[PDB]
Amino acid sequence: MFIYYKRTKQGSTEQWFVIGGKRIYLPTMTYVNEANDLIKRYGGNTNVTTYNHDNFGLKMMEAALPQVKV
Amino acid sequence: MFIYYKRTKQGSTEQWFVIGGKRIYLPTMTYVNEANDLIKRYGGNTNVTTYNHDNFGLKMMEAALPQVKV
Amino acid sequence: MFIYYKRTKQGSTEQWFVIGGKRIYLPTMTYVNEANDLIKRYGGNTNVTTYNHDNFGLKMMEAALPQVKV
Amino acid sequence: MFIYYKRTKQGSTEQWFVIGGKRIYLPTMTYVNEANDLIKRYGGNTNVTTYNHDNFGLKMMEAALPQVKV
């Protein structure tokens, strides 16, 4: 599990949480805090990387990790 | 793999087992024991955390980890 | 990734390979060897455990890890 | 996450990226570079192994890890 940042085409920065082979968009700072709590408890990765929307690394992550909504 | 606890709306506490990107409700103490045996054998996480039913961390785990029944 | 053994109802012992959240029955010693090669290369778990067909730990693994055929 | 090489029946060598329980064919050196960047950031495995198309280890990986396209 880890969090990454996504710089959108419209300019905003989104925080996304990878868990269980899935991707979750974090809509509020309270969701961000709880995701970081999960990372701390379950040995997740504390790396934070910001990806431009067109970055190939981001694209491969979005292809392999289905989005789920909370 | 790890176990967590869930405090239900009706007040009970459920034990859940995360494995293979899935969630398993543990119906008996014998299932709990065997799950902890799996954790010990395969390098799982021994963290035990109790989540209120409405906690956002729990909610993200339930969204990303499909339930399977045993 | 890891291998486990399953003692079947008819008495035989099957070797199974867990990878990618899936279970693979290993039909020959050549498949067993190649699976152990994968374990050695990709940091898998070298634990070998034998499960009776009715063991609850095995049952939870079979519920959470879909079988795929090779 | 890790990269492996596949020696095809027609003789070419393909680079594949394993992430999230999925397999991604890497079509360009820029995709290879970004995949290795992901490996470095998220604690992936730096092992590089070349598999002949008929190798049983490769076959089990292809059975257990669905291909996704980028």
Author numbering:
A (entry chain A), B (entry chain A), C (entry chain A), D (entry chain A): 168 to 237
Can you quote the paper on this entry?
Endolysins are hydrolytic enzymes that specifically recognize the host cell-wall and cleave the peptidoglycan to digest the bacterial cell-wall for release of phage progeny during the lytic cycle, which is why they hold promise for the treatment of multidrug-resistant bacterial infections as an alternative to antibiotics. LysIME-EF1, an endolysin isolated from E. faecalis phage possesses a highly efficient lytic activity to multidrug resistance E. faecalis. PSI-BLAST search predicted that LysIME-EF1 consists of an N-terminal catalytic CHAP (cysteine, histidine-dependent amidohydrolases/peptidases) domain and a C-terminal CBD (cell-wall binding domain). Our finding provides structural and functional evidence that LysIME-EF1 belongs to a unique two-component multimeric endolysin encoded by a single gene.
Following extensive crystallization trials, we obtained crystals that diffracted well in the space group I422, with cell parameters a = b = 59.88 Å, c = 87.01 Å, α = β = γ = 90.00°. Ultimately, the dataset diffracted in the space group I422 was proved to be LysIME-EF1 CBD and the structure was solved by molecular replacement method at 1.75 Å resolution using the CBD from WT LysIME-EF1 as a search model. There was one molecule in an asymmetric unit. The CBD comprises a four-stranded β-sheet capped on each side by one α-helix. Crystallographic symmetry analysis suggested that LysIME-EF1 CBD forms a stable homotetramer. The oligomeric interface contains 1318.9 Å2 of the buried surface area, accounting for 28.25% of the monomer surface area calculated by PISA. The LysIME-EF1 CBD was cloned into pET 21a(+) with an N-terminal His tag and the purified LysIME-EF1 CBD was subjected to size-exclusion chromatography and the elution profile is 17.7 ml in a Superdex 200 column (GE Healthcare) with an estimated ~32 kDa, supporting that LysIME-EF1 CBD forms a stable tetramer in solution. Detailed analysis shows that the tetramerization is mainly mediated by extensive hydrogen bonds and hydrophobic interactions. In addition, a sizeable hydrophobic interface is formed by the neighboring protomers, where the residues M227, M228, A230, A231, L232 of α2 helix from one protomer pack against hydrophobic patches 183WFVIGG188 and 191IYLP194 of the other protomer. Differing from that of LysIME-EF1 CBD, the elution profile of the LysIME-EF1 CBD F184R&Y218A is 18.7 ml, confirming that the residues F184 and Y218 are essential for maintaining the oligomeric tetramerization of LysIME-EF1.
